[model samples]
Target: CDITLQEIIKTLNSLTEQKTLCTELTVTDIFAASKNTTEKETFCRAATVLRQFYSHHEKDTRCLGATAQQFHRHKQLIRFLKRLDRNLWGLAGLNSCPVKEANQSTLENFLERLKTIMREKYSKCS
Candidate 1:
């Protein structure tokens, strides 16, 4: 994607404020972090799986009403996020993240934490 990582992260910042259609977002496959699951991959799993909640769930795109342009931006935001995260992060503390049931707030809490970790890591200036 031509969009820079900065804009991508900004997009996530935007999503953090997203107003979706569901009253209580139902994330089908929730994730649990463990001593064995690296924070990076745990974040990765959360990222992808949450994307599924919006992408494939019968309820649909998970977004509430928006201008057509806004919807397109939302689509572009997530598409880039998926690829950016996948390329930057892969594997467990040993290569796995276990699953469980959870509310969307809890699910997004993990994603937010994960986003912070990645933001710091990337900014840490290897």
Candidate 2:
């Protein structure tokens, strides 16, 4: 059975909205925060698990586990992932949101653009 665009959008919205905790925060960051790593990692991992469980849903079959490298070249994938990471951080309530100099795109728009780019680039791969 073919997947509908609405289903894909729903999956995307859920994935982007869920926040992930960075478990195993490095010793340096922990020290900087003046928190003990033991408790922090445990808490972070628990939080991560809870987040994943609560947001559990099947992603678009086409898009599931489709890394940037599958679509773009290594260099391009790196750049794209960096941009995506920035947007993700912002979407998860980071200090600043990503912005195109002229277009003024929203995080949702940026992600949709990423999905479009991936689909176009990986058209032959699939």
Candidate 3:
């Protein structure tokens, strides 16, 4: 999590050469523009998701060879998530509410929202 956005993008691009898919933005921009603790926590959570992908790919031999194509797709999804987070925070002027107090139904609803968003945006990619 200590790593910068530049480093994450650099590593991902080095591996896939498709970092341009999420261009002209940085994590610092999102954090600086975040309006509240909830927004900032959301940003961090999204970044952690991307970081986990990188960590898994580098450390797991199973994420190689036959599974490499799937791994690349996973990277693309991560890229989309990062871009989506920034767009919501910056252009759309949206903020994610804290999930700490969310009930089971609320969590399910949020998950469904994410699933719908991903399906709507990246169905073609799949």
Candidate 4:
């Protein structure tokens, strides 16, 4: 699904206030804020992918009796989200047209890169 920078910026802005990781702060929240149906669907799919990875990590950590580490990981995730929020805000400051195809591709690429980072960094927690 194709998406515009404006939708990404809006979704990122909507999530900027979240200081913790919870169901309410997932990509579904971005989906809810999205004005474009395709963008909403894309975000939902991305959210599902992330949720699955997180669920696995949560279960593995529980099985390993790593509760304290889990809490630390949660804090780290919060920091990552905050960093992403700031980066998105910086991107939004540039007055580029949202409809530009280049911007759309760039935003989509950014999401994909984020997913890659999540997979690489979190998939080994088990």
Q: Tell me, by TM-score, which candidate is best.
A: 1
Clashes of 2: 0
Model 4 lDDT tens row, 14-99: 33433333423223223223455453344334444344434544434332334776476565544444444444444334333232
TM-score versus the correct structure, for each prediction? 0.50, 0.24, 0.32, 0.31
Model 4 worst lDDT window (10 residues): 97-106
TM-score of 3: 0.32
List of clashing residue pairs for candidate 1: 38-93, 92-95
| Cα-based RMSD of candidate 2 | 18.4
Instruction: For each candidate in the order shown, give its overall lDDT on alpha carbons.
Output: 0.50, 0.33, 0.38, 0.39
Maximum-lDDT candidate: 1
Clash tally, candidates in order: 2, 0, 0, 0
Candidate 2 residues 78-100, lDDT tens each?
Answer: 33334434333333343332221
Please say which candidate is ahead in lDDT: 1 or 2: 1
Give the lDDT of residue 61 in candidate 1: 57
lDDT of 1 at 69: 65
Instruction: Rank the candidate models, highest TM-score first.
Output: 1, 3, 4, 2
Runs of candidate 2 exceeding 4 Å displacement? 1-100
Q: Give the runs in model 3 whose Cα sits over 4 Å from its true position.
A: 1-66, 91-97, 102-126
The digit string of per-residue lDDT tens for model 3 on 57-122 reads 443444333566756655564555455445434422434433343122222233333344333433
Root mean square deviation (Cα) for candidate 1: 5.4
TM-score of 1: 0.50
